[PDB]
Symmetry: C2
Subunit: 218 residues, 2 copies
């Protein structure tokens, strides 16, 4: 049974587009579906989910679409505050609207004592970003006499990266593409990959169980 | 048509073990099969192959097995010197036996002027290692006044990493496992993944063409 599942929640836009609906109709399934996935996963004993909600590259989408997502993301608090999930966000929080920053901070503060499933939401995150910010911190420490070049090792990076040990055992990507798309690059070094054509809004208990059984076959 | 294919050449050990033969019988297919793959790929117009021959983690195999591989790897020169392929090795060369180091250096020197397919052989390489060595170089530059913390960006890393732009368009992993196994972690951020149960010694033109056609369907 995986302890840590990484989740690339792709296929929300296409789900709507395929039906001739506007993209908001797909995106509105994001937190409700993720919640469902968390509930099923905690019952199966899974301890951590890291879910990719907004990539550093997604700012390239249409302005209105980006603005819709950023407003929708403020539903974070209402969606997870009383779920018993411990919520953390990783990514560059200071690029986000201040109201979203406060919603995130509040959601983190209120759930930090919860001891069930730890949900990490990667929001304005990318692998490049994570490695770059960790590198800046390492350089800062070096320039302040706190470490030498020979002290630079994997464990130091695991201390400075936002996504931390234990690393994902399994990655699930919905929506049919077979890429990691600048998700948790460092952290996925030994993770088992599972790709399904099933679009995120259509991804249910049977789909998750199938991924896990595929994973349990080694 | 992919310009750069990354190749995880897995399944040589299992190919032999499955037949009740010792592992050397599988490993002896490595450079001959890779050569074949290079010939087919250059004719298809593919410009670069980065092939994973020995991971930083493979030192954990049995001593005799590790020693066999290191000796077999010295066939590098005879296998590729007159192939018209331009050969580069990436990985920590100074951990290798000195005779292998010279074989590698010689193979690089003699093929550097070739203008067909560029074969990069990842030998005692890992993604962690590549990011760590690049980070050490960045820290060294910072401690010598050559850059500030704000200069640390993706392009700087692309300059310091051993595996360089252009990054793999497609990754093929033979042997059935669906992991990147600490290969080119940074460089695989947008690479399409293709996994086949076909063991490396059995991987032929039809298998490669099938991977590429799978890739050409986007």
């Amino acid at each position: 049974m995986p302890k840590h599942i990484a989740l690339i929640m792709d296929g929300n836009r296409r789900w709507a587009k395929d039906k001739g609906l506007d993209v908001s109709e797909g995106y509105k399934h994001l937190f409700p579906k993720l919640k469902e996935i968390c509930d099923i996963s905690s019952k199966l004993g899974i301890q951590v989910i890291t879910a990719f909600a907004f990539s550093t590259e997604n700012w390239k989408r249409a302005k209105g679409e980006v603005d819709f997502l950023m407003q929708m993301f403020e539903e974070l608090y209402d969606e997870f505050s009383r779920s018993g999930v411990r919520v953390s966000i990783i990514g560059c929080k200071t690029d986000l609207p201040m109201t979203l920053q406060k919603c995130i901070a509040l959601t983190e503060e209120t759930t930090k004592g919860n001891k069930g499933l730890h949900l990490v939401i990667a929001l304005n995150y990318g692998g490049y970003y994570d490695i770059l910010q960790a590198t800046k911190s390492i350089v800062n420490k070096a320039m302040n006499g706190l470490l030498d070049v020979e002290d630079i090792n994997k464990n130091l990076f695991d201390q400075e990266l936002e996504s931390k040990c234990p690393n994902p055992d399994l990655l699930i990507r919905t929506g049919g593409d077979q890429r990691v798309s600048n998700f948790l690059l460092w952290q996925l070094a030994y993770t088992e990959f599972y790709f399904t054509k099933t679009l995120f809004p259509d991804f249910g208990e049977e789909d998750l169980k199938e991924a896990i059984i595929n994973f349990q076959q080694r």
